């Protein structure tokens, strides 16, 4: 059998001296029948008065449940599972894929015999005045906290030299599947296949016959997975006449599942239908546009569309475009544009910011992810040149930069709109702003402002001032705030005020911006 | 095994492992599993809860570096630094890390020098494994090995006296003033006489460090021709700040020649008042304020400001304001530059105060956690977190 996990209770804490609920008799008689068996079998220990400790069992033909929250909030922690799963991209292609399924796997693995004492319950006996049996987990108690890390944990020591000796075949444990994998002709497949159920049947293990098991396509958490190929699970929009705030919800919902694969899936004009809802279940008319959204989606959705397995041998290249402002679609492939995976990006960092800026972030989500997915960083392609972005790049008070990248002349092409003059321009008019401004040129405008905070009145002489102004300006605040800001060059913000600002800016011949206390 | 634990109260530190490169992740397989055959560690069972993140940093040998910050700041304190040392001419650093994989570890605190070698797309679970042997990295590694290695250098130590050696951490640095050529002589005899003893690779390219050299990058003022009123409001705006520093700088003379809103190109001739006043404020910058002294008992921060160009500025204090140092440092790439900056830094903060400082550096979270290791070389890690640069204080340490 395999070695032992050593587990122990939380420091200081003690065993679990629980109450057993009453028993009816039909269901007493049920529990002997179970555990006999189990007995019989070696996963349980009749003990006796010695041992304390009680965890409630009860009854659900009839099944044994065990309640261990109490244990399990007296167990010490696990490094636990996972709660990272592949993700299809990172799939390598294979002929052939069987998942076995390790029946009762917790039941076949055995418990650290210092801790059994503490996995003790008691099935009540039928008649008043005589005492019931008293028993202990010599295994892997279903339902217990520590089942699943030391299942896993002892399933891989166990995989270990089977691994090693068929390198030819690859090995994902998940839960109670086993998912063994290969390029071998099916029939030298389904022999292995056949080995390995003798391996883990060397050591307690029990999985299912060539006649149960389970071969693609796999429908595992929201996806499609062939041999060759994945995708996500078949995904239909209603066609209601009436959207409730949360139909729109979940429609968004799985429509943002769908842009992992599915290219340019956009919802914008559904999102902005939650606006204001007052209820989940207020409903709202769809909108021209939403309607647009919707219809469109619609299609996408109809063509079945395929993400291929990453290629090993082959680079990764993840291309970005700009789908709308603060929009942006990449795609990740090897072979021409031959997705293996795609994506969308929102994400807006800052209540300001620009296109450059926003583009450099997507570089980095992408390339995070792709590090998680493939191990490796792709060579990307980006709407932008090289001098424009070393141009916002050395300009920029924060530091980064973008892995290897080739300029891709696929409008749009990401931009810098306006850049303010280095150096006071001469002959251009100068004003001092404050709600007002006032020039050296002798003119000057007060504006009571309503409702304003100190610092979007600040903005508000700034944008004041470039209105009146021509095509060159200069400008001088106190506002190191107004400074920041429009010293960051941003091309969108969620203010009005300052979009107003970009645009004055934008238009501009000249545009010189200067702090003074 | 000097039995070592944890500070009262204190549980293991349980560090997420940030994602690497397939690359990263070989090399450490590699490497860990020579470790394991040679027993300085062993794999560990599901009943560990605890983790400290690995690197593999890189000679065309890769070297594992463990991010043990978190288990240093729970392991309890143990019970010098040469002011000298920071004089000598040349200092030389060497990684001796490696004297420790030859001391047993407290088979109770091994559970806590767990780590993880991740996976690529979560596709295994990780190889984990502890320590049996004191970790490079550790703050208890030192103090533990401190014994055998006073010994260990007593002799060279009484044999080449006119030497300084100072360790810190996995460093040992030495210190002296002979010629360059003699220097580099010395330090090879040390090596083969840490050698004698037990099992030392250069550190910096096997290249020297100059403290003696090192210097305060002063605050300067725009000395120009002719004065504009954008130049002059820009002066103020520079003088009236480090005021908060230098209490004895006066702008009353220079913001007289401000008064009425003029053009910002019109040129402003000084009056021989507001002149003798920036002439008066250039000689109080001419040094470090006084009264500024070294608290051995508070952070010590340490703040970048990207300059543009390859060009970064730095100061190191304790109390805003009060700086101990100031700097500047010169080339590549933005990550690449300020990595080598933040070492540069703390190989100072150790030789001049033998404690690393606290970075706030001007980068994003994500892009630093993605490539620092790819240009990182020293054995140790400091304390850093993340900031926003405000636009003005770039704007006062500048250049020359
Ligand atoms: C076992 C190695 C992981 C692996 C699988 S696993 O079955 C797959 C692991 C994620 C959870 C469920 C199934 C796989 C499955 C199909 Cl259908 C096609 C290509 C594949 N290529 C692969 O590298």
């Not at chain 1, 587990?7 to 003690?14: E, N, R, S």
């Not at chain 1, 005589?130 to 089942?147: A, C, D, E, F, M």
Request: hydrophobic content about 35%.
């Amino acid at each position: 059998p395999i070695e032992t996990v050593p587990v122990k209770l939380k420091p200081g804490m003690d065993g679990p001296k629980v109450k057993q609920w009453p028993l009816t008799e039909e269901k007493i008689k049920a529990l002997v029948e179970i555990c006999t068996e189990m007995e019989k079998e070696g996963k349980i220990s009749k003990i006796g008065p010695e041992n304390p400790y009680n965890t409630p069992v009860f009854a659900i033909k009839w099944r044994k449940l065990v309640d261990f929250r109490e244990l399990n909030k007296r167990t010490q922690d696990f490094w636990e599972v996972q709660l990272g799963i592949p993700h299809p991209a990172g799939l390598k292609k294979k002929k052939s894929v069987t998942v076995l399924d390790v029946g009762d796997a917790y039941f076949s693995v055995p418990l650290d015999e210092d801790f059994r004492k503490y996995t003790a319950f008691t099935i009540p006996s039928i008649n008043n005045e005589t005492p019931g049996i008293r028993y202990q987990y010599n295994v892997l108690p279903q339902g217990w906290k520590g089942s699943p890390a030391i299942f896993q944990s002892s399933m891989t020591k166990i995989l270990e030299p089977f691994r090693k000796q068929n390198p030819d075949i690859v090995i994902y444990q998940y839960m109670d599947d086993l998912y063994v994998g290969s390029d071998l002709e099916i029939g030298q497949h389904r022999t292995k296949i056949e080995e390995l159920r003798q391996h883990l049947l060397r050591w307690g293990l029990t999985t299912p016959d060539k006649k149960h098991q389970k071969e693609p396509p796999f429908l595992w958490m929201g996806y499609e997975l062939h041999p060759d190929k994945w995708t996500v699970q078949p995904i239909v929009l209603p066609e209601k006449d009436s959207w409730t705030v949360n139909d729109i919800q979940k429609l968004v919902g799985k429509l943002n599942w769908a842009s992992q694969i599915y290219p340019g899936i956009k919802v914008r004009q559904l999102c902005k239908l939650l606006r204001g809802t007052k209820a989940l279940t207020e409903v709202i008319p769809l909108t021209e546009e939403a309607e647009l959204e919707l219809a469109e989606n619609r299609e996408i959705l109809k063509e079945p569309v395929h993400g291929v397995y990453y290629d090993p041998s082959k680079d990764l290249i993840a291309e970005i475009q700009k789908q709308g402002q603060g929009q942006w679609t990449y795609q990740i492939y090897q072979e021409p544009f031959k997705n293996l995976k795609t994506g969308k990006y929102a994400r807006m960092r800052g209540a300001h910011t620009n296109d450059v800026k926003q583009l450099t972030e997507a570089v980095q989500k992408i390339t995070t992810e792709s590090i998680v997915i493939w191990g490796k960083t792709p060579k990307f392609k980006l709407p932008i040149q090289k001098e424009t972005w070393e141009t916002w790049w050395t300009e920029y008070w924060q530091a980064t930069w973008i892995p290897e990248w080739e300029f891709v002349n696929t409008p749009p092409l990401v931009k810098l709109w306006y850049q303010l003059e280095k150096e006071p321009i001469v002959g251009a008019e100068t004003f001092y702003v404050d709600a007002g401004y006032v020039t050296n040129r002798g003119r000057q405008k007060v504006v009571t402002l309503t409702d304003t905070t100190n610092q979007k009145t600040e903005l508000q002489a700034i944008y004041l001032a470039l209105q009146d102004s021509g095509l060159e300006v200069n400008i001088v605040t106190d506002s190191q705030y107004a400074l920041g800001i429009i010293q960051a060059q941003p091309d969108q913000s969620e203010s009005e005020l300052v979009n107003q600002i970009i645009e004055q800016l934008i238009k501009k011949e000249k545009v010189y911006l200067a702090w003074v206390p | 095994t000097v039995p070592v634990k944890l500070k009262p109260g204190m549980d293991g530190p349980k560090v997420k492992q940030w994602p690497l490169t397939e690359e990263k992740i070989k090399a450490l397989v590699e490497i860990c599993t020579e470790m394991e055959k040679e027993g300085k560690i062993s794999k560990i069972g599901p009943e560990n809860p605890y983790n400290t993140p690995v690197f593999a940093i890189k000679s065309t040998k890769w070297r594992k570096l463990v991010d043990f910050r978190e288990l240093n700041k729970r392991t309890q304190d143990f019970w010098p630094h040469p002011a000298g040392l920071k004089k000598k001419k040349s200092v030389t650093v060497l990684d001796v890390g490696d004297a420790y994989f030859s001391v047993p570890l407290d088979e109770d605190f091994r559970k806590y020098t767990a780590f993880t070698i991740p996976s690529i797309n979560n596709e295994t679970p990780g190889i984990r494994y502890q320590y049996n042997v004191l970790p490079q990295g550790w703050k208890g590694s030192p103090a533990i090995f401190q014994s055998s290695m006073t010994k260990i250098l007593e002799p060279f130590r009484k044999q080449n006296p006119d030497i300084v050696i100072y360790q810190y951490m996995d460093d040992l640095y030495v210190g002296s003033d002979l010629e360059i050529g003699q220097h580099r002589t010395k330090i090879e005899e040390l090596r083969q006489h840490l050698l004698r003893w037990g099992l030392p690779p250069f550190l910096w390219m096997g290249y020297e460090l100059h403290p003696d050299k090192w210097t305060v990058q002063p605050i300067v003022l725009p000395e120009k021709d002719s004065w504009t009123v954008n130049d002059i409001q820009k002066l103020v705006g520079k003088l009236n700040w480090a005021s908060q520093i230098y209490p004895g700088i006066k702008v009353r003379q220079l913001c007289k020649l401000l008064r009425g809103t003029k053009a910002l190109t019109e040129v402003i001739p000084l009056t021989e008042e507001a002149e003798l006043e920036l002439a008066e404020n250039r000689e109080i910058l001419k040094e470090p304020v006084h009264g500024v002294y070294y608290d051995p008992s508070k952070d010590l921060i340490a703040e970048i400001q990207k300059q543009g160009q390859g060009q970064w500025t730095y100061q190191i204090y304790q109390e805003p304001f009060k700086n101990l140092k100031t700097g500047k440092y010169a080339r590549t790439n933005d990550v690449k530059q300020l990595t080598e900056a933040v070492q540069k830094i703390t190989t100072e903060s150790i030789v001049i105060w033998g404690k690393t400082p606290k970075f706030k550096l001007p980068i994003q979270k994500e892009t630093w956690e993605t490539w620092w290791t790819e240009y990182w070389q020293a054995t140790w890690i400091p304390e850093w977190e993340f900031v926003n640069t405000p636009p003005l204080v770039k704007l006062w340490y500048q250049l020359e």
